[PDB]
Amino acid sequence: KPNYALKFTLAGHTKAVSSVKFSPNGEWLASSSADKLIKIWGAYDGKFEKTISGHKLGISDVAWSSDSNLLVSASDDKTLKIWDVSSGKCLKTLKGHSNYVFCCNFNPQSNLIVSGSFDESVRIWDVKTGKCLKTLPAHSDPVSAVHFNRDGSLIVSSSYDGLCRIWDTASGQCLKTLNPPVSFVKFSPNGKYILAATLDNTLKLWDYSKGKCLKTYTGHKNEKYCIFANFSVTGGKWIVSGSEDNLVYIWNLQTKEIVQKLQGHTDVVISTACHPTENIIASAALENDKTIKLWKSDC
Numbered sequence: 001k002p003n004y005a006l007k008f009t010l011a012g013h014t015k016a017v018s019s020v021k022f023s024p025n026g027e028w029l030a031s032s033s034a035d036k037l038i039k040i041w042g043a044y045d046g047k048f049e050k051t052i053s054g055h056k057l058g059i060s061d062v063a064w065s066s067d068s069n070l071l072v073s074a075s076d077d078k079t080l081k082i083w084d085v086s087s088g089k090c091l092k093t094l095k096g097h098s099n100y101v102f103c104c105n106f107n108p109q110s111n112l113i114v115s116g117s118f119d120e121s122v123r124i125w126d127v128k129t130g131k132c133l134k135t136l137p138a139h140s141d142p143v144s145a146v147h148f149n150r151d152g153s154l155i156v157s158s159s160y161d162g163l164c165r166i167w168d169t170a171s172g173q174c175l176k177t178l179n180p181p182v183s184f185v186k187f188s189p190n191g192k193y194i195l196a197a198t199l200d201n202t203l204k205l206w207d208y209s210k211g212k213c214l215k216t217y218t219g220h221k222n223e224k225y226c227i228f229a230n231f232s233v234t235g236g237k238w239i240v241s242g243s244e245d246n247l248v249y250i251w252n253l254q255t256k257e258i259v260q261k262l263q264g265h266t267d268v269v270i271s272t273a274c275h276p277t278e279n280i281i282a283s284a285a286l287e288n289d290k291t292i293k294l295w296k297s298d299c
């Protein structure tokens, strides 16, 4: 069992925190917020580094490029923005969605960005030009998550419509459809499995090639919000997720037993992230809390 303990509470956002992500080189934590700002924090000392501003409405999501130099943010102003982290400057504004942009990610090469929107579409953008390359009529309800697999050849998307769809990046064509609302989806690190959250207090680990569910994780509270979930792989093999009972849940991946519930937040833990090399979790909560917490375990 892990023994995550609170190391830092990061305060500064003035509305709900929407997403936290560690940079791939492990050095930074980025946070987005309904307060229209991105904040950058030291991953190991918790130290506030800078605020990045420019969006006209709340930010739902942020994601890092592979070299840790760029960020992309998704916003209720219906755009995404590409940021140079070291200068804080907006490089591109990605325009095209007809409703709030909810989720975003770079591919491993980081020449592409994928986005999902309340307009029920998934878009694929060129990082260099900022132009939309493809619009996928992906779903029949808001898109809750978008994720590239390990080499970027595939995109997985999820939606309130209850579907999880896998797309061929190069052509935009749908390869597989896996119905309670699906509130989150992500590829496993090797790209073989998919972790999917549904709004019936349930996480499931699917085999992608087989199209069958392998494990089911329950005990948390998730019926209203799209809550990030993670594979923790630096120590023991865990599943990590937030919860609407203000706790961070950690399951043993193989046995599906809840092995730790992290107490401290005073609102829904909407986002969790796992550090790329250290046994460190970042968690962030909604507007009655507005803080980010950094936790460290020996295993």
Ligand SMILES: Cc1nc(F)ccc1-c1cc(Cn2ccn(C)c2=N)cc(C(=O)NCc2ccc(Cl)c(Cl)c2)c1
Residues within 6 Å of the ligand: 016, 017, 018, 019, 033, 034, 035, 057, 058, 059, 060, 061, 076, 102, 103, 104, 142, 143, 144, 145, 146, 159, 160, 181, 182, 183, 184, 224, 225, 226, 227, 228, 270, 271
């Ligand atoms: C707090 C905040 N502030 C802003 F300014 C803008 C957005 C948000 C926000 C963030 C998250 C976490 N998050 C973000 C990206 N990703 C992949 C996530 N999991 C979730 C929600 C949510 O649950 N909103 C209702 C809802 C229910 C069902 C569906 Cl289907 C959808 Cl799409 C949304 C809202």
